[PDB]
Design a protein around this ligand. Structure first.
Ligand SMILES: C[C@@H](O)[C@H](N)C(=O)O
Length: 321
């Protein structure tokens, strides 16, 4: 019997946060906003609670949970060997970045870190998350709030679709600012590795880390709607695809809305952050509409659209080069 409690994103009612914190203490799972996507969270020091997360999501035990912290002091407790990167961290945290470090903490059980010697750590730039973590008094382990294979929840409607009646409490602070999961950068190797593109853009990371490695899986793509997804990187074949795949809805930019019959305008090329903010909602809207095929325009592999394309690639049933 799920409670949905709305809070202001800037100055949330601390009485609501206290209630969430009490649930966390009881080893319960809750859902809460961040600046990236909604999180489904539990006490990071509680094995049995974090196991519930994997179950609710239907997630493989080998995929570790990101551990959310509110301070640099907490970092010192849970990770080691990051001291050379402190300048970097202080430039991007709090913020839409997860970093991989060597695990130090004894309190975070294997289940959270998937038995790995590393820990994924994020300090979220969202007052609700920060205040919740601080008030609760432990780090929170939290992947995105969605059934695995479905698009990451960027608002409470999506969370309800996936989890109503499955968790005691959802904190609603509206649509998430970015709409996309945090950039993940691994810093435990000779050269830093990008494991997931996000709001901290590749171009910016390459400025700070000239030797940044971008593995094949990142460039070549999980996040999927319930109807076959056709991603069209070559927009010359757009004409051909529409006819090939007949029973269709389109997701397209503002600047080409007029070129289609039934089309969700995800956002404009002029403000690509709009596209990122809305892409997952668009996937969820499109699946509900009464069409057999979801057809999505591809975007530049640059800036935030890099991350968008990464997500669309991992979701597509067919890509059209
Ligand atoms: C919940 C949210 O913080 C997510 N784990 C991310 O890294 O974007």
């Amino acid at each position: 019997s799920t409670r949905v409690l709305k809070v202001d994103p800037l100055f949330p009612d601390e009485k609501v946060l206290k209630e969430a914190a009490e649930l966390l203490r009881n080893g319960e799972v809750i859902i809460f906003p961040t600046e990236t996507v909604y999180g489904i969270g539990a006490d990071a020091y509680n094995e049995e609670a974090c196991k519930k997360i994997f179950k609710l999501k239907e997630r493989p035990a080998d995929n570790p949970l990101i551990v959310h912290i509110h301070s640099f002091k907490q970092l010192e407790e849970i990770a080691e060997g990051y001291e050379p990167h402190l300048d970097f961290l202080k430039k991007f945290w709090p913020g839409p970045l997860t970093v991989i470090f060597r695990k130090k903490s004894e309190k975070i059980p294997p289940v959270v870190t998937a038995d790995l010697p590393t820990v994924a750590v994020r300090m979220p730039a969202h007052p609700v998350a920060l205040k919740l973590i601080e008030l609760f008094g432990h780090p929170i382990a939290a992947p995105s709030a969605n059934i695995s294979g479905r698009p990451s929840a960027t608002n409470v409607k999506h969370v309800i679709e996936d989890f109503m009646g499955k968790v005691k409490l959802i904190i609603d602070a509206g649509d998430t600012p970015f709409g996309l999961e945090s950039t993940i950068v691994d810093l435990t190797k000779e050269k830093p590795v990008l494991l997931r593109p996000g709001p901290v853009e590749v171009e910016r990371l390459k400025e700070l880390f000239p030797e940044l490695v971008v593995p094949d899986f990142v460039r070549k793509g999980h996040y999927a709607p319930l109807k076959p997804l056709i991603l069209v990187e070559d927009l010359t074949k757009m004409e051909e695809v529409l006819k090939k795949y007949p029973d269709h809805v389109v997701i397209c930019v503002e600047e080409r809305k007029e070129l289609y019959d039934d089309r969700i305008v995800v956002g404009s090329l002029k403000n690509p952050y709009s596209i990122a903010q809305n892409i997952f909602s668009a996937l969820r809207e499109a699946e509900k509409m009464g069409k057999e095929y979801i057809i999505v325009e591809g975007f530049e592999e640059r800036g935030i659209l890099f991350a968008v394309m990464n997500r669309l690639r991992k979701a597509a049933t067919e890509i059209v080069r």
